[PDB]
C-alpha cells in the first residue's frame, strides 16, 4: 500500500461480454474476449499482453496484471468473486469470431497440482474465444476460458482461470 496510488482512466463500458479486437495482419480482428463487471474489464493476459485498450476516446491501462495467473484487469482490481464448486455444472458463453455468442453447458473435471485444484473444461472453441466467461447457475462468472492443454488424442481442455476479487 502507498499514500498516493496512481490513477488510470476508468473503464466506461456497460456490463457484459465484449469482443476484444486488435489491429494486425489483414486489419482489425477479434483476438479474444473480456467481461465488464462493476466498472472493471477482465480478460486473460495472453489475449492483450497488457496492451492499452482504447474506448470512448480514452486510453485504458491495466490496473492489475499477472502473467503467472494469466489474468488482467483494466479500470480497477479484479472484481469476479465467484468460485467454481466441484461437482456443479457450468456454462461457457462462447464468443467465437464472426459468430453469435452461444452458451454451452458442461460438467468440469479437475486439473491436479501440488498447489491445489483447478476446474477443467473439456470444450474446444475456435481461436479467439479466450476470455469467454465460465458461469454458474446464478449468472456469476467463476472463471475465464482459454488457457488449456491439448491432450494426447487431440482433445482440448481449458483451465477455469480465476483469482480472488480485490
Amino acid at each position: 500500500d502507498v499514500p498516493s496510488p496512481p490513477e488510470t482512466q476508468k473503464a466506461e463500458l456497460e456490463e457484459g461480454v465484449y469482443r476484444i479486437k486488435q489491429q494486425g495482419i489483414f486489419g482489425k480482428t477479434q483476438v479474444g474476449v473480456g467481461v465488464q463487471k462493476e466498472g472493471v474489464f477482465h480478460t486473460m493476459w495472453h489475449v492483450t499482453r497488457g496492451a492499452v485498450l482504447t474506448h470512448n476516446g480514452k486510453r485504458l491501462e491495466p490496473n492489475w496484471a499477472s502473467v503467472k495467473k494469466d489474468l488482467i484487469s483494466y479500470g480497477g482490481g479484479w472484481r469476479l468473486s465467484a468460485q467454481w464448486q466441484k461437482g456443479e455444472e457450468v456454462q461457457v458463453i462462447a464468443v467465437e469470431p464472426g459468430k453469435n455468442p452461444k452458451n454451452f453447458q458442461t460438467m468440469p473435471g479437475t486439473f491436479q497440482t501440488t498447489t491445489g485444484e483447478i476446474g477443467a473444461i473439456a470444450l474446444d472453441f475456435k481461436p479467439g474465444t479466450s476470455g469467454s466467461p465460465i458461469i454458474n447457475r446464478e449468472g456469476k462468472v467463476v472463471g475465464l476460458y482459454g488457457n488449456g492443454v491439448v491432450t494426447k488424442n487431440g482433445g482440448y481442455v481449458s483451465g477455469i482461470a480465476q483469482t480472488n476479487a480485490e
Partner: peptide, 20 residues
Amino acid sequence: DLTVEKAADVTWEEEAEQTG
C-alpha cells in the same frame, strides 16, 4: 491498441447446448 465491442450479457441459459 486494442478496441472492444459488446457481444452478450452474462446469463445462464436454461436451453444451452448440451453437452460438455
